[PDB]
RNA sequence: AUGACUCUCUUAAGGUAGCCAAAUGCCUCGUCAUCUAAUUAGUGACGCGCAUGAAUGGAUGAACGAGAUUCCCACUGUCCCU
RNA sequence: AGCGUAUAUUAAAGUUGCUGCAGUUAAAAAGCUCGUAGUUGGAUCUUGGGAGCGGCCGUCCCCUGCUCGGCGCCGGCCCGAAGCGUUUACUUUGAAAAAAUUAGAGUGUUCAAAGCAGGCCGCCUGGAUACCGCAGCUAGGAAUAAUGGAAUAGGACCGCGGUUCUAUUUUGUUGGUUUUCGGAACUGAGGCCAUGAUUAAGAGGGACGGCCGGGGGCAUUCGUAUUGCGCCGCUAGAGGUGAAAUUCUUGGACCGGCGCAAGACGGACCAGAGCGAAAGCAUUUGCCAAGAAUGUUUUCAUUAAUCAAGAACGAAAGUCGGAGGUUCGAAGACGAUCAGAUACCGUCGUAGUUCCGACCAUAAACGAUGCCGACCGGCGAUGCGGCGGCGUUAUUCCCAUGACCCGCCGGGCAGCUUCCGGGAAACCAAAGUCUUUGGGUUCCGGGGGGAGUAUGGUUGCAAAGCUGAAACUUAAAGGAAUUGA
RNA sequence: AAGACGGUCGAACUUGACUAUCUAGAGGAAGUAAAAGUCGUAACAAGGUUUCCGUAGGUGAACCUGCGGAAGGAUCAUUA
């Protein structure tokens, strides 16, 4: 979240190596534009984003909803 | 650690057929193995059996007919297709006259002769010929 | 196979690559040292300036002096011992005549008695020395 | 930021004196200038003042230890050998 | 078998099939809780309490007789401890071994028994963060440890 | 050619590690290689060492020097010629 | 109407092994244990009917609801629309996927390779379909494999009582406001649900009970011998060897005695017995932390298994500075030996042998044999713990504790027997459950030399340790068993 | 329209280090292969002092001798 008016999000998934009939983890980080109306977000919270026109060199996403981490109540 | 149950049980019965006990007790019991067992006792490769509910997990005492060369399992449970089930059977049952491959579909745990009638692929569990 | 997991797929695949470099008929293949050494450099034939005729002895059980040549190639400007084949065909190389060298059978591995020698003759300047043996063409004056 | 890859206090000597004396000085010129817990009061301020003559700067008590450390090593078991010949005789 | 030494041993209690409470056992589920508050006010763990009941006041299993097991009746009211009983011990054993490598500088064995106790707190601790009993910036430091016997 | 080997006279033993035409080698401006258009010079090997050789110390080495010696870039009335 | 030679490449090779190989002795498993990334993870929640079809048997259809427009029925019910109803993977279908290549229909190019043409004495007919990984889009299923929800209740579902922002459903036209309802947001007192905690693994962690072991660490007491000295005998040889001699001796050597002194080592008891993570560990007492096993109707509740990087320990030699120097004993000096011996043996003897401090990291560091898990025969011993049972013996006075006697159960070191089975055999109850080929996971080999070399990087005071090639060189190295000599 | 400041964009040539592949060499040495070369026999049988591992020191040359291993040994064994 360290950048001002922005965050970075992890996006995990798997990929079918075909010879050996199995999978290997793969990750792709991307940057996202958290706009202060979401007054409360932490690391690990789920975030739901959507495509939009380029806000920088490396920004083409905007935040739509928090979906909070499990437990987290206190 | 006992990482995977089925294959405890499935070797066990085979190793009680090579030797040849009148019946076999198989230790921690599940709703996949009792299930598998009923699929076998639906084509006659074993006879009727009893499960013993001790308040932990069960034990099961099968009665083994000597019509059972080998039972075995596949691991991990690969993901199969309706286009990709010839080239298991064609490399995992002995003959084109006999053999069976149990797998798990949304519409139930059942043998490969029936999942071609219901037209449903899915996972894979083991075989018996 | 030994590492049977369902999402291993890379553990499995970093190991065979690693491995295949132990394979010989491959590493001999997958490094630049095989083509650095080789006289032909990577090739099925390559011509050269002869310079002296030379007899090489044969190795044991067998014995009999074997008739060879010492060629300088063009492209590299490198020097090879070669070997004539037929009976009485050495009388057909004159010193500093040109020859089309070839390989000899098994790729970087000699044939039979004669040590070192991995190359041999097909031509002697635009007509094959096979023919010369039979006599189906004869030499210019 | 770590400033020296092996020369303790003995950066204060540079290239001089040769390798194995600078190693030999490192083990004595770190122990002499340390502090120790005064057993009497409990604090962490024993400290040398000359050759083998030490001083707590809190309860003003003063000890005779070893030149470069606070106990000499077989004066630790010279006390446990005199204590044990107090057992042999008294009965 | 055992996590930290070759022993592939075996030896446990075996609980019976029927679960309902025995005959002679008069002690009602709402009479007994005075006894669990009183043996927990004395500096004595819910495991230790779990015995003294089952020798002198004859009872099958405290769970069966009430509803709820012994960490639950102590801790919701305000009589139980802040760190798990099992983490307290490992630490206390830590603090009697590293104290042993003071004046017995060369007792090498002890040192190799002190690179398995600290592989059992950390390991026990990182569990205890995911089920959320320990606050999450917690740290077993032997420096500070001696405080909390 | 060469000498791994073999004998034979002798003393208290008879020079073992290393290290050289040296701040130490007569013959000598020793000889192969390196730097120059040209080098009794300087440095890199060869040891036969008149008289090298181990706290009478042997072989090596970062820093250091108003210490002894060679060659290259800079710069000059030191020289051409005043 | 072709057929050889040379080099690239595939099949041959299950000689790269995902399908599918090896690793006791053929090439090969880190000296030991911990460990993060990686991979892998016990069981448990929806299961029985009623009808419908033909000959008890096999099929199909019935198992979350709360504004309009039609099936009309009578503001009540059935049915289509306007919007929605833990989230993934998996799976069946539906779009969307240029040609040419491939596969495949049709058609007599005179046959084929091919093409996209053709057929009926103006006209009839084609220019088909299939396959086109992964990723994304769409609708069904909900077995198997991942995530969630009600605990200091900040809980569901209901009704009742205010506050504050407020489009007009309403006061014919013009001033205004509560009227009246909906549409935000806060909040107090209540009634109600069967109100809300799966189980305690022949998985683990930890407690507690009486035990056991040459496990480790610090002091402490003993024992005879070997070597050095101090005296008291008597006397001539005493060492050594296959045989001699170097070496000691009337300067009293060797054997005999009574004393003292230090520097090693722990005999016999000692076993196919014991404890330790591996190296390893054997004189009596005192103390200090640890340990496996057994015992338990104690407690936690999945906390576990294997492990790139990184870490603790690591015989014997070898190093750096002290302390100590009896025996032995690399280097050296002699005596014998032999054609020659700078080797065996024999006489001395340094570094070293022993303590306290810190380096070093390898050995046939061995069972030449990965760790955790399931399973598959028979017996005779044995060690530790627990339980049952005749009878001798001890403490006499028997209570129970020790000693001897026959089994039962758990973990340990080994044996014997055998057509469980395996293998190339020797041999292995594991080296078994392997073309009847899949329980989870880590290291590693791919014909011989060259060669553990060169080089570079790394670690050390040093020797050396970890990593580690190439050119060239060759049809056999090699394994287990036969007969011979 | 010629031309002249200022600005950007900017080839090319000169000076330096960084990096890649090949290349000369006094002298020092490894390895490999070649029909009647020379000193000795360390190894295979209790190869005539058992063999081999680690590490240190010696020796014309195979190889020795010290200390701790292991049978891959010439003993599965030895008597209250």
Swiss-Prot record, chain A:
The gene is RPS11. Citrullinated by PADI4. The chain holds residues 80 to 153 of 158 of the full protein. It comes from Oryctolagus cuniculus. The modification Phosphoserine is found at residue 31. Component of the small ribosomal subunit. Part of the small subunit (SSU) processome, composed of more than 70 proteins and the RNA chaperone small nucleolar RNA (snoRNA) U3. This is Small ribosomal subunit protein uS17. Component of the small ribosomal subunit. The ribosome is a large ribonucleoprotein complex responsible for the synthesis of proteins in the cell. Part of the small subunit (SSU) processome, first precursor of the small eukaryotic ribosomal subunit. During the assembly of the SSU processome in the nucleolus, many ribosome biogenesis factors, an RNA chaperone and ribosomal proteins associate with the nascent pre-rRNA and work in concert to generate RNA folding, modifications, rearrangements and cleavage as well as targeted degradation of pre-ribosomal RNA by the RNA exosome. It is found in: Cytoplasm; Nucleus, Nucleolus. Belongs to the universal ribosomal protein uS17 family.
From Swiss-Prot, chain B:
The keyword Cytoplasm applies. One of its GO terms (biological process) is translation. Pfam families: Ribosomal_S8 (PF00410). It is found in: Cytoplasm; Nucleus, Nucleolus. InterPro entries: Ribosomal_uS8, Ribosomal_uS8_CS, Ribosomal_uS8_sf. The keyword Ribosomal protein applies. GO terms for cellular component: cytosolic ribosome; nucleolus; ribonucleoprotein complex. Keywords: Cytoplasm, Nucleus, Ribonucleoprotein, Ribosomal protein. The modification N6-succinyllysine is found at residue 87. GO terms for molecular function: structural constituent of ribosome. Transmembrane segments: none annotated. Component of the 40S ribosomal subunit. Part of the small subunit (SSU) processome, composed of more than 70 proteins and the RNA chaperone small nucleolar RNA (snoRNA) U3. Component of the small ribosomal subunit. Part of the small subunit (SSU) processome, first precursor of the small eukaryotic ribosomal subunit. During the assembly of the SSU processome in the nucleolus, many ribosome biogenesis factors, an RNA chaperone and ribosomal proteins associate with the nascent pre-rRNA and work in concert to generate RNA folding, modifications, rearrangements and cleavage as well as targeted degradation of pre-ribosomal RNA by the RNA exosome. Required for proper erythropoiesis. Belongs to the universal ribosomal protein uS8 family. HAMAP family: Ribosomal_uS8_A. This is Small ribosomal subunit protein uS8. The lineage of its organism: Eukaryota, Metazoa, Chordata, Craniata, Vertebrata.
Swiss-Prot record, chain D:
One of its GO terms (cellular component) is cytosolic large ribosomal subunit. One of its GO terms (biological process) is translation. Coiled coil: none annotated. It is found in: Cytoplasm. Keywords: Cytoplasm, Metal-binding, Ribonucleoprotein, Ribosomal protein, Zinc, Zinc-finger. Its main location: cytoplasm. Gene3D superfamilies: 2.20.25.30. InterPro entries: Ribosomal_eL37/eL43, Ribosomal_eL43, Ribosomal_zn-bd. SUPFAM superfamilies: Zn-binding ribosomal proteins. One of its GO terms (molecular function) is structural constituent of ribosome. It comes from the Eukaryota. Zn(2+) binds at residues 38, 41, 56, 59. Component of the large ribosomal subunit. Component of the large ribosomal subunit. The ribosome is a large ribonucleoprotein complex responsible for the synthesis of proteins in the cell. HAMAP family: Ribosomal_eL43. This is Large ribosomal subunit protein eL43. It comes from Oryctolagus cuniculus (Rabbit). The gene is RPL37A.
Curated annotation (Swiss-Prot), chain E:
The modification N6-acetyllysine is found at residue 26. The modification Phosphotyrosine is found at residue 37. One of its GO terms (cellular component) is cytosolic small ribosomal subunit. It is found in: Cytoplasm; Nucleus, Nucleolus. InterPro entries: Ribosomal_uS15, Ribosomal_uS15_arc_euk, Ribosomal_uS15_N, uS15_NS1_RNA-bd_sf. SUPFAM superfamilies: S15/NS1 RNA-binding domain (SSF47060). The modification Phosphoserine is found at residue 29. Gene3D superfamilies: 4.10.860.130, S15/NS1, RNA-binding. The keyword Endoplasmic reticulum does not apply. GO terms for biological process: translation. It holds the Pfam family Ribosomal_S15. It comes from the Eukaryota. There is a cross-link at residue 42 (Glycyl lysine isopeptide (Lys-Gly) (interchain with G-Cter in SUMO2)). Keywords: Acetylation, Cytoplasm, Isopeptide bond, Nucleus, Phosphoprotein, Ribonucleoprotein, Ribosomal protein, Ubl conjugation. GO terms for molecular function: small ribosomal subunit rRNA binding; structural constituent of ribosome. Ubiquitinated at Lys-26 by RNF14 and RNF25 in response to ribosome collisions (ribosome stalling). Belongs to the universal ribosomal protein uS15 family. Component of the small ribosomal subunit. Part of the small subunit (SSU) processome, composed of more than 70 proteins and the RNA chaperone small nucleolar RNA (snoRNA) U3. This is Small ribosomal subunit protein uS15.
